[PDB]
């Protein structure tokens, strides 16, 4: 019960073929390329500014998100116990 999204998604899974992305940026060639050069410069700037924020930003968060994942995990195993305890009781009852 979805729009166009479902038609191309089901076709991609049935055919077993992922849609091709931009295989351009990585290769390139020295000596149109004035644009390609200026795109590279800006890209690098973004990465570097972004990378710099990310290290410092990453450094600040590099482990703050890891703590959240431990709070998320322990909650699941508490429910594993709560389910374990009910079922055991039921089994015991049946046995008796």
């Amino acid at each position: 019960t979805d729009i166009m999204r479902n038609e191309f998604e089901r076709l991609a899974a049935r055919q077993p073929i992922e849609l091709l992305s931009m295989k351009r940026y990585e290769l390139p060639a020295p000596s149109e390329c004035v644009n390609n050069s200026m795109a590279q410069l800006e890209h690098q700037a973004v990465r570097i500014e972004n990378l710099e924020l990310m290290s410092q930003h990453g450094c600040n968060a590099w482990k703050v998100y890891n703590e959240n994942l431990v709070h998320m995990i322990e909650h699941a195993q508490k429910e594993l116990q709560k389910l374990r305890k009910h079922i055991q009781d039921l089994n015991w009852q049946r046995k008796n």
């Binding site: 019960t1 899974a13 890209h43 290290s55 699941a76």
Partner: protein, 131 residues
């Protein structure tokens, strides 16, 4: 800690007041517009009935190799691959389950008739020893 629709770790979790279960806002907002009821309990639920729960901007750090280039090309491609091949595989899991249930029931019936047939057989054989 997770969403009860997609299997996400929500960025803006919101709880419904009819059935205490945390959903990601976008996915619960979509369900209410499709059919105005709670997805799990099938109880009457609206967009105003929801209650947002503070998350204080869930930790998602940006990778060291983060640029406009991979985020446009490689990362966004993988996200619509992972959405496509999962729901297709999830649609494959529904039907299988249904079929399984059906056949299970079918097999189960055949044994009931054997027991009912043997319940008349045994006690009358025991009764004949009594006679």
């Amino acid at each position: 800690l997770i969403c009860s629709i997609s299997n996400e770790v929500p960025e803006h979790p919101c709880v419904s007041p009819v059935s205490n279960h945390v959903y990601e806002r976008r996915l619960i907002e979509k369900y209410i517009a499709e059919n105005g009821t709670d997805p799990i309990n099938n109880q009457p639920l609206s967009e105003e009935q929801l209650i947002d729960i503070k998350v204080a901007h869930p930790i998602r750090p940006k990778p060291p190799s983060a640029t406009s280039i991979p985020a446009i090309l490689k990362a966004l491609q993988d996200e619509w691959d992972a959405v496509m091949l999962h729901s297709f595989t999830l649609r494959q899991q529904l039907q299988t389950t249904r079929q399984e249930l059906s056949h299970a029931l079918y097999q189960h019936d055949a044994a009931c008739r054997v027991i009912a047939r043997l319940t008349k057989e045994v006690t009358a054989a025991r009764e004949a020893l009594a006679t």
